[PDB]
Amino acid sequence: AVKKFKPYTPSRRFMTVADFSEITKTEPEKSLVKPLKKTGGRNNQGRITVRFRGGGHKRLYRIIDFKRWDKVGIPAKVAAIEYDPNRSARIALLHYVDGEKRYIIAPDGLQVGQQVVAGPDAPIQVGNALPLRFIPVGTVVHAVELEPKKGAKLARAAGTSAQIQGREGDYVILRLPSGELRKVHGECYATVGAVGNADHKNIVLGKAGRSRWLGRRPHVRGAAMNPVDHPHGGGEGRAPRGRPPASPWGWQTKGLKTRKRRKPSSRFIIARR
Amino acid sequence: MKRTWQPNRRKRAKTHGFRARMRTPGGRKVLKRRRQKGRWRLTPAVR
RNA sequence: UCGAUGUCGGCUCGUCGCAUCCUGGGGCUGAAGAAGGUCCCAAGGGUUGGGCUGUUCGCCCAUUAAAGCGGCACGCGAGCU
RNA sequence: CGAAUGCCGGCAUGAGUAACGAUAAAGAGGGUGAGAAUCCCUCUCGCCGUAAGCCCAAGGGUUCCUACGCAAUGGUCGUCAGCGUAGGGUUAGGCGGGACCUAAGGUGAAGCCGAAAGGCGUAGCCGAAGGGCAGCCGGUUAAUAUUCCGGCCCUUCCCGCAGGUGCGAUGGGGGGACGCUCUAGGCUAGGGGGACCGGAGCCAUGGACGAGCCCGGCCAGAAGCGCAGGGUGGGAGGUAGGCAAAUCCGCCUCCCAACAAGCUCUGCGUGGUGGGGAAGCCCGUACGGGUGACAACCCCCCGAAGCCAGGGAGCCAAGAAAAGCCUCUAAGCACAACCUGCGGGAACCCGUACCGCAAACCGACACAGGUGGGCGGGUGCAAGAGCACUCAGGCGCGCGGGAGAACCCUCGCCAAGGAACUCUGCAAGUUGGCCCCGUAACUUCGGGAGAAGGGGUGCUCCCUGGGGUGAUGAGCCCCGGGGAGCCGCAGUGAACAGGCUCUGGCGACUGUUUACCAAAAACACAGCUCUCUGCGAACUCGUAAGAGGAGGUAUAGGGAGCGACGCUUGCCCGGUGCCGGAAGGUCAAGGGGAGGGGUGCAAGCCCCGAACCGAAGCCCCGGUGAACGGCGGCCGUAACUAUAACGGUCCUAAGGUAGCGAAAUUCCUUGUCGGGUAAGUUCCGACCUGCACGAAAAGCGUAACGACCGGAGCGCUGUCUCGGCGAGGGACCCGGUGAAAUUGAACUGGCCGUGAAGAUGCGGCCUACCCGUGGCAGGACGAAAAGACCCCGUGGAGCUUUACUGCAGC
RNA sequence: CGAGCUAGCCCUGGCCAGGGUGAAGCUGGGGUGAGACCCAGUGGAGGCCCGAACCGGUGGGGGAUGCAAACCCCUCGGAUG
RNA sequence: GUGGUUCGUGGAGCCAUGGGGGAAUCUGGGCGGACCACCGCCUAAGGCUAAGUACUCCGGGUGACCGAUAGCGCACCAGUA
RNA sequence: CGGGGGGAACCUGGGGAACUGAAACAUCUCAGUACCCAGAGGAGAGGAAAGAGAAAUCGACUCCCUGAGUAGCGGCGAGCG
RNA sequence: CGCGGGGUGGAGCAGCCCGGUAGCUCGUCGGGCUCAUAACCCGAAGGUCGUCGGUUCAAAUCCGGCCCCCGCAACCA
RNA sequence: CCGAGGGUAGGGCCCGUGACUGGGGCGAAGUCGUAACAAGGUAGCUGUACCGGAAGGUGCGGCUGGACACC
RNA sequence: GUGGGAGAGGGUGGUGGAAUUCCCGGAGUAGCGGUGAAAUGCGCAGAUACCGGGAGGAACGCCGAUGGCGAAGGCAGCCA
Ligand SMILES: NC[C@@H]1O[C@H](O[C@H]2[C@@H](O)[C@H](O[C@@H]3[C@@H](O)[C@H](N)C[C@H](N)[C@H]3O[C@H]3O[C@H](CO)[C@@H](O)[C@H](O)[C@H]3N)O[C@@H]2CO)[C@H](N)[C@@H](O)[C@@H]1O
Ligand SMILES: [Mg+2]
Ligand SMILES: [Mg+2]
Ligand SMILES: [Mg+2]
Ligand SMILES: [Mg+2]
Ligand SMILES: [Mg+2]
Ligand SMILES: [Mg+2]
Ligand SMILES: [Mg+2]
Ligand SMILES: [Mg+2]
Ligand SMILES: [Mg+2]
Ligand SMILES: [Mg+2]
Ligand SMILES: [Mg+2]
Ligand SMILES: [Mg+2]
Ligand SMILES: [Mg+2]
Ligand SMILES: [Mg+2]
Ligand SMILES: [Mg+2]
Ligand SMILES: [Mg+2]
Ligand SMILES: [Mg+2]
Ligand SMILES: [Mg+2]
Ligand SMILES: [Mg+2]
Ligand SMILES: [Mg+2]
Ligand SMILES: [Mg+2]
Ligand SMILES: [Mg+2]
Ligand SMILES: [Mg+2]
Ligand SMILES: [Mg+2]
Ligand SMILES: [Mg+2]
Ligand SMILES: [Mg+2]
Ligand SMILES: [Mg+2]
Ligand SMILES: [Mg+2]
Ligand SMILES: [Mg+2]
Ligand SMILES: [Mg+2]
Ligand SMILES: [Mg+2]
Ligand SMILES: [Mg+2]
Ligand SMILES: [Mg+2]
Ligand SMILES: [Mg+2]
Ligand SMILES: [Mg+2]
Ligand SMILES: [Mg+2]
Ligand SMILES: [Mg+2]
Ligand SMILES: [Mg+2]
Ligand SMILES: [Mg+2]
Ligand SMILES: [Mg+2]
Ligand SMILES: [Mg+2]
Ligand SMILES: [Mg+2]
Ligand SMILES: [Mg+2]
Ligand SMILES: [Mg+2]
Ligand SMILES: [Mg+2]
Ligand SMILES: [Mg+2]
Ligand SMILES: [Mg+2]
Ligand SMILES: [Mg+2]
Ligand SMILES: [Mg+2]
Ligand SMILES: [Mg+2]
Ligand SMILES: [Mg+2]
Ligand SMILES: [Mg+2]
Ligand SMILES: [Mg+2]
Ligand SMILES: [Mg+2]
Ligand SMILES: [Mg+2]
Ligand SMILES: [Mg+2]
Ligand SMILES: [Mg+2]
Ligand SMILES: [Mg+2]
Ligand SMILES: [Mg+2]
Ligand SMILES: [Mg+2]
Ligand SMILES: [Mg+2]
Ligand SMILES: [Mg+2]
Ligand SMILES: [Mg+2]
Ligand SMILES: [Mg+2]
Ligand SMILES: [Mg+2]
Ligand SMILES: [Mg+2]
Ligand SMILES: [Mg+2]
Ligand SMILES: [Mg+2]
Ligand SMILES: [Mg+2]
Ligand SMILES: [Mg+2]
Ligand SMILES: [Mg+2]
Ligand SMILES: [Mg+2]
Ligand SMILES: [Mg+2]
Ligand SMILES: [Mg+2]
Ligand SMILES: [Mg+2]
Ligand SMILES: [Mg+2]
Ligand SMILES: [Mg+2]
Ligand SMILES: [Mg+2]
Ligand SMILES: [Mg+2]
Ligand SMILES: [Mg+2]
Ligand SMILES: [Mg+2]
Ligand SMILES: [Mg+2]
Ligand SMILES: [Mg+2]
Ligand SMILES: [Mg+2]
Ligand SMILES: [Mg+2]
Ligand SMILES: [Mg+2]
Ligand SMILES: [Mg+2]
Ligand SMILES: [Mg+2]
Ligand SMILES: [Mg+2]
Ligand SMILES: [Mg+2]
Ligand SMILES: [Mg+2]
Ligand SMILES: [Mg+2]
Ligand SMILES: [Mg+2]
Ligand SMILES: [Mg+2]
Ligand SMILES: [Mg+2]
Ligand SMILES: [Mg+2]
Ligand SMILES: [Mg+2]
Ligand SMILES: [Mg+2]
Ligand SMILES: [Mg+2]
Ligand SMILES: [Mg+2]
Ligand SMILES: [Mg+2]
Ligand SMILES: [Mg+2]
Ligand SMILES: [Mg+2]
Ligand SMILES: [Mg+2]
Ligand SMILES: [Mg+2]
Ligand SMILES: [Mg+2]
Ligand SMILES: [Mg+2]
Ligand SMILES: [Mg+2]
Ligand SMILES: [Mg+2]
Ligand SMILES: [Mg+2]
Ligand SMILES: [Mg+2]
Ligand SMILES: [Mg+2]
Ligand SMILES: [Mg+2]
Ligand SMILES: [Mg+2]
Ligand SMILES: [Mg+2]
Ligand SMILES: [Mg+2]
Ligand SMILES: [Mg+2]
Ligand SMILES: [Mg+2]
Ligand SMILES: [Mg+2]
Ligand SMILES: [Mg+2]
Ligand SMILES: [Mg+2]
Ligand SMILES: [Mg+2]
Ligand SMILES: [Mg+2]
Ligand SMILES: [Mg+2]
Ligand SMILES: [Mg+2]
Ligand SMILES: [Mg+2]
Ligand SMILES: [Mg+2]
Ligand SMILES: [Mg+2]
Ligand SMILES: [Mg+2]
Ligand SMILES: [Mg+2]
Ligand SMILES: [Mg+2]
Ligand SMILES: [Mg+2]
Ligand SMILES: [Mg+2]
Ligand SMILES: [Mg+2]
Ligand SMILES: [Mg+2]
Ligand SMILES: [Mg+2]
Ligand SMILES: [Mg+2]
Ligand SMILES: [Mg+2]
Ligand SMILES: [Mg+2]
Ligand SMILES: [Mg+2]
Ligand SMILES: [Mg+2]
Ligand SMILES: [Mg+2]
Ligand SMILES: [Mg+2]
Ligand SMILES: [Mg+2]
Ligand SMILES: [Mg+2]
Ligand SMILES: [Mg+2]
Ligand SMILES: [Mg+2]
Ligand SMILES: [Mg+2]
Ligand SMILES: [Mg+2]
Ligand SMILES: [Mg+2]
Ligand SMILES: [Mg+2]
Ligand SMILES: [Mg+2]
Ligand SMILES: [Mg+2]
Ligand SMILES: [Mg+2]
Ligand SMILES: [Mg+2]
Ligand SMILES: [Mg+2]
Ligand SMILES: [Mg+2]
Ligand SMILES: [Mg+2]
Ligand SMILES: [Mg+2]
Ligand SMILES: [Mg+2]
Ligand SMILES: [Mg+2]
Ligand SMILES: [Mg+2]
Ligand SMILES: [Mg+2]
Ligand SMILES: [Mg+2]
Ligand SMILES: [Mg+2]
Ligand SMILES: [Mg+2]
Ligand SMILES: [Mg+2]
Ligand SMILES: [Mg+2]
Ligand SMILES: [Mg+2]
Ligand SMILES: [Mg+2]
Ligand SMILES: [Mg+2]
Ligand SMILES: [Mg+2]
Ligand SMILES: [Mg+2]
Ligand SMILES: [Mg+2]
Ligand SMILES: [Mg+2]
Ligand SMILES: [Mg+2]
Ligand SMILES: [Mg+2]
Ligand SMILES: [Mg+2]
Ligand SMILES: [Mg+2]
Ligand SMILES: [Mg+2]
Ligand SMILES: [Mg+2]
Ligand SMILES: [Mg+2]
């Protein structure tokens, strides 16, 4: 957990780096599994549609298995634990006995020697995937399918997890990382345990640049613009907002609920406190 | 100091070039106008 | 005078007025002497260096015969700042 | 046509005036020629030399070479030229690019969307300064050369012979295939020295015939070999995966290696031949050509950032694709095919001159500006691409000759004094490199720190330690140490090279910004908090399709404020915004048809049309402060006086807590006191009557940081008392070239008046021969710009909102 | 019709003399019940320091019908991000 | 719900049609300015159709059209420098 | 077998402004104009009544004259027709 | 000067704005409870509404003048 | 050479003094309330934490040096 | 040393039921709460009281003593 640094510079002071002892590889990754990708924050018309993005280190994209159900019953050994620079979490390289090599997002608790499976069969132990209906109430669980066969959308980020609070008919009730209480279909695959690399939240960037390396550009406050530019700005000598605080496009940024009311999804949600 | 003309022979024909004009309706009427007027050169020099 | 008469203060350079700050000449005095008070004549000349402030001004330090008030587009930016 | 700051052209004034475009710098002889400071040669002088030399890419497009020219172009001249006329000149299977690959992007069968034009989109395709791929050294022309030629190597295609083999691809696998910082061992470019090798020639002016002085001592090169490195397991058995099949690949198991041991690839070395080859003298050259010679062609050292190259180590931000390439099987074919080696053949299109930090490119100019890559020698100074001189090479900047005023610019020095200058030490000075001693508050324990403040610095001789390379030796090279002397005003002797301290404000910090008047206390920033978003996410761009978000998933993503860190961030929910509320109230279309009307003989057809049911929204109830925001008044009171812990009452949704406080906020104000100073509207501490601080438009501190803004001291000064002298480029005189704004016309004086109120022009009076040159700026309400301030116009435009009315969005 | 200037991002290359400080880590030693830790050498971190190239544009002077429609001189900021 | 028409919601018919409902074939259906009756007119939901009309790159004829600052931008090697 | 692209102006179709007028300005106007797009051609469009509209009338369409600045339309305004 | 609000028993506030009526809390005075004071309970007193002029039958009330008060404003210059 | 000492520079310690500021001692009869001693009228005390004109109040835990009716 | 003992002695992981609160459903009506007495609050938008489900956190009643253990602070459901 968390390398620190004596302050031989300002900003080497509170700067903080992850603990990579867990990483069993480096300079990988399995060349069979990874293409590349690009963007700018700009979109197919050339237009910035997400602000303050660009720069940052070149990445290769590790292809990664979110359908574990196509291997039902085939076992696999955990081969390696290494670094993915497209996600908060770390990926486990695993060899199947098919001789197929695949990437899994690494649960907290995997040592690399261990066997993992997926399917209704599936001993209930860290690393194994099952359909939710066969997992006993109370299990902490990650990488969940939202609908059956569509891939795992939930609890994928470092340290996240979910809990089975009970079942109703064809569906099971899940407490998400948000605390929202959600029904999910019994046939959705999930793997048991929590994501791990959970100390991720305690890295401390420590200098401006380390934000740029992650591709995050400087973010300027409405407050500091002119009135063409943003609902708050001018007059200056600073100013309070002069108005209920707003986004550049004019909507209100405190309190104002953006989820749409009539989504058929609403029929499956009970929460989010 | 750096002025506004920084000639690049490729850039000139991919921007104002004859094929370039011919691709955009905006651009075809640029040609029609120049032909209708009798320009000697409908489209720039580049070597 | 708006088909433009650049505006405070400083600096440089001055010039003029006298309702005189000093020096010269006077009357009166509640002028013994010395030293002052006040009023008259007189524009020849002279009228310091410095702390503060953009400052003019003003206060202040140290001197002085004295540390004069004004005009010249609040003299002077085709002379400077 | 007389006026429009009219329009077009022509010609004036200014005026022979300013300038002639870097202060690197010129002088003479000879030549050519009608004509020469300017063209050609020689000699002397000066300037560049991590360039002002040389190569490459862009871009330019004949500017290249030579002959004959000088009207113009050339900031003068021109006999010269980048100029005129003409002729000539660019040679590639190997260099660059294409009959190869893929990247962003582009384009796009399929497909999707859009009134039309069109928008999108998987495969494919196109796309390069990336990947792939075979040429090195010399000679030759006036002008091209890895292109022609000489010598020595090499690649593909085609066909044939031999030998080999399950052959075969657009398909499967391997590889290609990668970051940043540090970096080992061995090489090479490159460089330095030699008493050793080769060479014309030299003894000057006191000395020197010398182990003298000056010149040179390499280049390329298949196989073979050697040194150094990269890459790399071998065998079987199973095998369900690698969208078919694989013997390949993956995966499991057993067996031997464990090491480059081998196999293999590249670097360098050497190598058959090949080829260069100075100073000097001589001719004879916009250029170089004989000889030197039959040249020599060797040792030692220094040593890459280049090579071996996928080398190694560490770190986190985690570091392209595809083809060539090899392997695998598929159809298919096995006469084929493929592999290997030898041989003959065949091997296309375009670029190729020249300029290329510039007089040939971008800047209207032969323009002090701008322009990517590579090479960039020697010596000295700690190093170095820094600095001074200098190789090769290239230049003296396309007006000159004088003179030696004011004034200006760039620079040098100054008696005594030393910030007295001034808004302000602005400016300039001081300081200055390296080694050694030494070094405070405070501090986040790193810093502060080059703190401060000092000492050393050259040359000669004596002794002497360690290293590199060689042997462990000399030599050569690097790092020192001690000892005794010498000279000068002075030894980082010239050049490049911090002035320092105390103390405030603001901002944590490095960063960022108004291209071209603002670099900052503004923006950003790690970090804290609120808020939205369950994923076909929210949000954003788009009519849409689609895309970004994100091939992400709440430890994530969007929005907002605050802005490291420390200690903290009070009270109010009445209004407003957001959030929750299944009732109640009102509510549009629609449902409803009480009742009424028009017209018909009537059946009807046709209008209105009450109750009632009926969304969101508003009303209503409530919650919400790191949401918009807001956080009182008058009166009294203590055994001196003052003051008021205390009380009274009026109002509020609530009445400002902590901490700060004449402040980047304090009007009165230069508040009062204290400090500093001889003297302090500034500045520092303090008091609190805070006009009008106050807690994330954050409050109060904070080490470190700052081309920020304020205050003081030391050091030192031409800032100043207060100027002086000197240098150079101008200014002035002469020869050549020769502008510009401006200009109603001029025969253009002072004063006191007058006049539209500031008269050369009118009145009176004074003064005044005609014309210039160098100078100064008081005046022509001097020039420039149809005043930007101010108002006007029912002029215009950016911006705001509970202005009006719309629209997107929801 | 324009991103051949300028602003951002995407793709692919390249550049950054020389010096100065000396983080973690590792090794050894001390310490301890075992540690923390302390010291030494090694090591070579960093929007670290000095300073060329390259990037800037602080202060001042000159220029102002300019060499230049933003320049020149002197000084000065960054210079592995 | 809109457009067209002189018709701007007007008593608003007619022609057209984005949306909902949705017939009949002579006794069928549209129209004559809301609607009703009467009396008339006409036969939608398929198509083609000369000429009389517009215009002038081009050829010709004619000007109380210009005559090189005019007449086209161009009398000339001009959409050129 | 055909299509594609071009053509001065003219024609039809899909779409469609603003200045300006209203002596400000929203309806209105400019205006179905400018423009953009698609398709015709030597012309294009339109054309043989589910028409006019008051006469027991007229007979497809186009163009000119007239009706007529009439009927109307209109912040019953400017104006439109 | 400019605009807005204000002046009422001793203190602090209503009432004015709509003419006839002056009220609330404290305080003061008398009495009670208590050993005594406060607290608490029962009673009471107290004003011409800043001032001057007008309007009306009648003025705290409506109007004007002045006098004080509090508040905002004083910009381009 | 060393050398009294003079000079320049930077530290350390101690005393004095300073606008102002913090509490404290002490001083017959000033103001405000009643915290404590009798369940002192809320048992008291206590470390600590927040708050409040003031004594003090409240939270968490603690000590006894506190505790004849009624459920 | 050997052999035996009692114990809430400490660390770790697990786990059980009672209760409180919150929600969902059921039924049900006019108050509930609270105090010295009240009021604030809660409730006809259906509260309290009653039944069923669920979420979650905390502390462990009886055994329990005037008891045991620990150096002190302290240590109490149950299992390893
Ligand atoms: N020295 C005792 C300490 O001081 C305090 O005591 C101080 C005050 O509280 C106390 O003041 C008292 C006051 O409480 C009491 N109720 C009224 C009394 N008259 C005052 O007394 C004071 O007043 C006068 C001056 O006029 C002096 O003469 C008298 O000595 C003095 N005590 O007098 C002391 C100072 O003189 C506290 N008791 C406490 O902090 C501690 O016990
Ligand atoms: Mg595009
Ligand atoms: Mg960010
Ligand atoms: Mg942030
Ligand atoms: Mg920001
Ligand atoms: Mg701003
Ligand atoms: Mg904009
Ligand atoms: Mg806005
Ligand atoms: Mg604002
Ligand atoms: Mg402000
Ligand atoms: Mg405000
Ligand atoms: Mg130009
Ligand atoms: Mg190019
Ligand atoms: Mg380009
Ligand atoms: Mg032609
Ligand atoms: Mg004027
Ligand atoms: Mg004029
Ligand atoms: Mg006199
Ligand atoms: Mg006298
Ligand atoms: Mg006398
Ligand atoms: Mg005089
Ligand atoms: Mg005088
Ligand atoms: Mg001053
Ligand atoms: Mg004054
Ligand atoms: Mg005046
Ligand atoms: Mg003046
Ligand atoms: Mg001036
Ligand atoms: Mg002046
Ligand atoms: Mg003047
Ligand atoms: Mg006239
Ligand atoms: Mg002249
Ligand atoms: Mg002259
Ligand atoms: Mg001259
Ligand atoms: Mg001759
Ligand atoms: Mg001759
Ligand atoms: Mg001759
Ligand atoms: Mg050199
Ligand atoms: Mg070229
Ligand atoms: Mg000439
Ligand atoms: Mg060849
Ligand atoms: Mg090629
Ligand atoms: Mg090609
Ligand atoms: Mg071919
Ligand atoms: Mg190609
Ligand atoms: Mg290609
Ligand atoms: Mg298609
Ligand atoms: Mg496209
Ligand atoms: Mg391709
Ligand atoms: Mg290429
Ligand atoms: Mg290449
Ligand atoms: Mg090639
Ligand atoms: Mg050659
Ligand atoms: Mg094979
Ligand atoms: Mg591959
Ligand atoms: Mg060599
Ligand atoms: Mg050397
Ligand atoms: Mg001699
Ligand atoms: Mg010589
Ligand atoms: Mg050599
Ligand atoms: Mg060789
Ligand atoms: Mg010979
Ligand atoms: Mg490597
Ligand atoms: Mg391909
Ligand atoms: Mg060539
Ligand atoms: Mg240059
Ligand atoms: Mg270059
Ligand atoms: Mg040249
Ligand atoms: Mg040029
Ligand atoms: Mg020149
Ligand atoms: Mg130039
Ligand atoms: Mg230059
Ligand atoms: Mg350059
Ligand atoms: Mg070099
Ligand atoms: Mg040096
Ligand atoms: Mg140099
Ligand atoms: Mg010159
Ligand atoms: Mg001097
Ligand atoms: Mg001195
Ligand atoms: Mg002074
Ligand atoms: Mg200075
Ligand atoms: Mg310091
Ligand atoms: Mg020093
Ligand atoms: Mg310091
Ligand atoms: Mg010496
Ligand atoms: Mg010497
Ligand atoms: Mg060596
Ligand atoms: Mg010098
Ligand atoms: Mg120096
Ligand atoms: Mg320095
Ligand atoms: Mg300091
Ligand atoms: Mg200050
Ligand atoms: Mg800063
Ligand atoms: Mg920096
Ligand atoms: Mg820095
Ligand atoms: Mg900024
Ligand atoms: Mg600027
Ligand atoms: Mg600037
Ligand atoms: Mg700066
Ligand atoms: Mg949209
Ligand atoms: Mg999407
Ligand atoms: Mg997407
Ligand atoms: Mg994606
Ligand atoms: Mg965010
Ligand atoms: Mg801010
Ligand atoms: Mg707050
Ligand atoms: Mg408070
Ligand atoms: Mg509120
Ligand atoms: Mg509320
Ligand atoms: Mg309702
Ligand atoms: Mg109805
Ligand atoms: Mg009837
Ligand atoms: Mg409603
Ligand atoms: Mg409310
Ligand atoms: Mg104060
Ligand atoms: Mg203030
Ligand atoms: Mg102060
Ligand atoms: Mg503030
Ligand atoms: Mg705030
Ligand atoms: Mg702040
Ligand atoms: Mg502060
Ligand atoms: Mg500070
Ligand atoms: Mg900075
Ligand atoms: Mg700064
Ligand atoms: Mg001087
Ligand atoms: Mg001179
Ligand atoms: Mg003129
Ligand atoms: Mg005359
Ligand atoms: Mg006059
Ligand atoms: Mg003058
Ligand atoms: Mg002059
Ligand atoms: Mg003048
Ligand atoms: Mg003027
Ligand atoms: Mg004007
Ligand atoms: Mg302006
Ligand atoms: Mg108006
Ligand atoms: Mg207007
Ligand atoms: Mg660009
Ligand atoms: Mg660019
Ligand atoms: Mg170093
Ligand atoms: Mg370093
Ligand atoms: Mg740095
Ligand atoms: Mg640095
Ligand atoms: Mg720095
Ligand atoms: Mg630096
Ligand atoms: Mg500058
Ligand atoms: Mg970078
Ligand atoms: Mg209409
Ligand atoms: Mg209409
Ligand atoms: Mg109608
Ligand atoms: Mg009808
Ligand atoms: Mg019918
Ligand atoms: Mg009909
Ligand atoms: Mg009809
Ligand atoms: Mg009718
Ligand atoms: Mg009809
Ligand atoms: Mg037709
Ligand atoms: Mg004709
Ligand atoms: Mg004629
Ligand atoms: Mg003409
Ligand atoms: Mg003529
Ligand atoms: Mg013409
Ligand atoms: Mg056509
Ligand atoms: Mg149409
Ligand atoms: Mg109008
Ligand atoms: Mg008008
Ligand atoms: Mg208007
Ligand atoms: Mg119209
Ligand atoms: Mg149309
Ligand atoms: Mg026709
Ligand atoms: Mg037709
Ligand atoms: Mg037709
Ligand atoms: Mg119309
Ligand atoms: Mg009365
Ligand atoms: Mg204003
Ligand atoms: Mg001594
Ligand atoms: Mg001493
Ligand atoms: Mg108590
Ligand atoms: Mg008590
Ligand atoms: Mg008590
Ligand atoms: Mg008590
Ligand atoms: Mg007690
Ligand atoms: Mg309390
Ligand atoms: Mg015991």
Side-chain angles (χ1 to χ4, degrees), chain A residues 13 27 38 41 44-45 49 51 53 57 59-60 62 83 85 98-100 147 153 156-158 178 180 182 198 200-201 206 211 219-223 230 240-241 246 251-255 257-259 263 265 272:
Chain A
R13 197 162 229 120
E27 209 48 1
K38 61 141 306 180
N44 83 270
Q45 330 163 300
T49 81
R51 302 153 73 220
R53 257 148 181 251
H57 220 251
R59 283 155 200 212
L60 277 291
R62 284 68 159 155
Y83 177 98
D98 285 277
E100 219 209 313
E147 321 193 56
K153 312 261 148 302
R156 300 170 25 164
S178 75
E180 162 175 322
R182 179 61 132 102
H200 172 49
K201 83 208 294 190
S211 268
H219 186 348
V220 314
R221 288 155 320 139
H230 197 245
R241 291 80 215 177
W251 40 268
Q252 295 191 19
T253 176
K254 296 301 204 291
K257 263 147 112 174
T258 40
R259 168 177 229 267
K263 241 180 131 181
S265 163
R272 178 277 259 191

Side-chain angles (χ1 to χ4, degrees), chain A residues 4-17 204-210 213:
Chain A
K4 298 164 203 54
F5 305 72
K6 314 193 139 206
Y8 43 97
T9 63
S11 87
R12 217 73 223 185
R13 197 162 229 120
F14 330 92
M15 180 156 235
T16 275
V17 176
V204 170
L205 272 277
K207 81 207 220 149
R210 203 205 205 128
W213 307 345

Side-chain angles (χ1 to χ4, degrees), chain A residues 26-238:
Chain A
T26 88
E27 209 48 1
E29 296 213 273
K30 233 58 176 280
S31 168
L32 50 147
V33 279
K34 88 207 62 45
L36 50 149
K37 34 80 189 173
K38 61 141 306 180
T39 202
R42 291 121 273 276
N43 87 323
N44 83 270
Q45 330 163 300
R47 297 298 201 88
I48 309 177
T49 81
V50 166
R51 302 153 73 220
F52 321 112
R53 257 148 181 251
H57 220 251
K58 176 181 247 176
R59 283 155 200 212
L60 277 291
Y61 169 54
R62 284 68 159 155
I63 167 61
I64 169 179
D65 181 54
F66 290 109
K67 322 170 168 162
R68 291 237 300 212
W69 85 76
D70 57 331
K71 281 298 203 189
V72 187
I74 304 165
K77 161 186 301 162
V78 176
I81 283 152
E82 70 218 317
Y83 177 98
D84 189 354
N86 307 47
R87 52 190 21 86
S88 54
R90 321 294 209 220
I91 47 173
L93 205 182
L94 50 72
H95 297 122
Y96 277 89
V97 312
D98 285 277
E100 219 209 313
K101 297 184 173 155
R102 291 200 232 223
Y103 269 138
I104 207 50
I105 171 182
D108 200 332
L110 282 204
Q111 333 88 330
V112 49
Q114 155 217 13
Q115 217 77 27
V116 281
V117 75
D121 52 285
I124 311 270
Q125 65 147 285
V126 53
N128 298 345
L130 303 71
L132 278 165
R133 59 186 315 175
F134 310 115
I135 311 177
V137 158
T139 308
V140 153
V141 153
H142 68 289
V144 193
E145 304 210 276
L146 211 30
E147 321 193 56
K149 262 52 96 177
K150 288 197 192 200
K153 312 261 148 302
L154 276 48
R156 300 170 25 164
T160 49
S161 34
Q163 230 180 248
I164 310 92
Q165 302 307 73
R167 23 181 86 87
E168 261 194 336
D170 300 9
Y171 279 87
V172 313
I173 287 103
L174 268 186
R175 197 203 53 74
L176 308 202
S178 75
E180 162 175 322
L181 272 202
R182 179 61 132 102
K183 297 180 193 171
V184 181
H185 199 304
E187 302 287 337
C188 297
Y189 263 60
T191 89
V192 302
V195 168
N197 180 37
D199 283 64
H200 172 49
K201 83 208 294 190
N202 305 337
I203 48 143
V204 170
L205 272 277
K207 81 207 220 149
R210 203 205 205 128
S211 268
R212 324 272 333 256
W213 307 345
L214 302 170
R216 315 199 196 250
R217 284 184 49 234
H219 186 348
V220 314
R221 288 155 320 139
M225 315 180 208
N226 298 334
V228 282
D229 294 318
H230 197 245
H232 330 115
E236 299 276 323
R238 332 195 154 101

Side-chain angles (χ1 to χ4, degrees), chain B residues 7-44:
Chain B
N8 161 302
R9 295 184 171 174
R10 182 199 265 218
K11 164 70 170 190
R12 188 160 180 81
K14 321 203 91 215
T15 281
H16 318 297
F18 181 103
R19 302 184 64 65
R21 312 230 156 279
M22 280 293 318
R23 196 156 229 110
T24 168
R28 308 195 272 292
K29 300 258 306 311
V30 194
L31 287 173
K32 310 180 67 280
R33 266 179 272 124
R34 294 198 76 101
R35 257 200 268 271
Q36 180 168 5
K37 188 191 187 175
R39 297 296 215 167
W40 288 3
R41 313 170 273 283
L42 308 210
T43 203

